[PDB]
Amino acid sequence: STDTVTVSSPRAGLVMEKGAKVKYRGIQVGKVTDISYSGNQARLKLAIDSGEMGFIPSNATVRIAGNTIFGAKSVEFIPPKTPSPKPLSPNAHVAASQVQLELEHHH
Amino acid sequence: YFQGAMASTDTVTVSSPRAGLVMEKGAKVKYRGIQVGKVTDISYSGNQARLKLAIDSGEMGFIPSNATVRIAGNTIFGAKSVEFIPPKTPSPKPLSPNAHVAASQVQLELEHH
């Protein structure tokens, strides 16, 4: 059985592999189940063993490893220098060198 | 193959040059301001990132074959694990069953290879 614990994030833009390990002194104790996105704040839903929490004081602290990555939002097609009369065959593919990763502009 | 009844949309795939692309749900596909499709799935293999798409078959007769791909987005934090640290002077009280920890106690380190 598990007890649900929660954590608010310093960065609202936090993505995490659904159901990732939760460690303490090297041993796993639970997993993250859900991630809530209320407004411009992010809060984590944790779930850890119902009896293991006796080994974690209330005033503990948290470390989250990770990387800075690109959170895409949409995908647009762009008309070229000269448009080809041929349309797009199904199952076709566009390589990486034809893809442009962009930042959106904020007022 | 065999014929589809209705609303039969086709697929087109995209290679992301930077492995590490995650994508927001509700990801739609546009072309000159018209929404034409959606994104099915995402996968990773080798050191590359695949993308499968779903575009309405009728709207593909208008997308040129030599069209480039634009992908908007914002840089975000790609978390991997959650760890706990014993405070310098720990509290005798164990963790309450429904405890909350705001951003104050959370620390967001980068990874090492």
Numbering used by the authors:
A (entry chain A): 39 to 145
B (entry chain B): 32 to 144
The authors write:
Despite extensive trials, only MtMce4A39–140 crystallized readily in several conditions in space group P65. Given the low sequence identity of MtMce4A39–140 to homologous proteins (∼15%), the structure of MtMce4A39–140 was determined using SeMet SAD phasing. Although Matthews coefficient calculations suggest the presence of 6–8 molecules in the asymmetric unit, assuming a solvent content of about 50%, the solved structure showed that only four molecules are present in the asymmetric unit, corresponding to a solvent content of about 71%. The domain-swapped dimer is formed by the extension of residues 107–141 from one molecule into the other molecule. The residues from 107 to 141 are exchanged between the two monomers to complete the signature MCE fold. Nevertheless, in the crystals the MCE fold is still conserved despite its domain-swapped dimer conformation.
The mammalian cell entry genes (mceA–mceF) encode the substrate-binding proteins of the lipid-transporting Mce complexes in mycobacteria. In terms of lipid transport in Mtb, Mce proteins are characterized as ABC transporters. It is now well demonstrated that Mce1 is involved in the transport of mycolic acid/fatty acids and Mce4 imports cholesterol. A common feature of each of these proteins is that they all contain a conserved domain of approximately 100 residues, now referred to as the MCE domain, which is characterized by a seven-stranded β-barrel fold, although the sequence identity of these domains is very low.
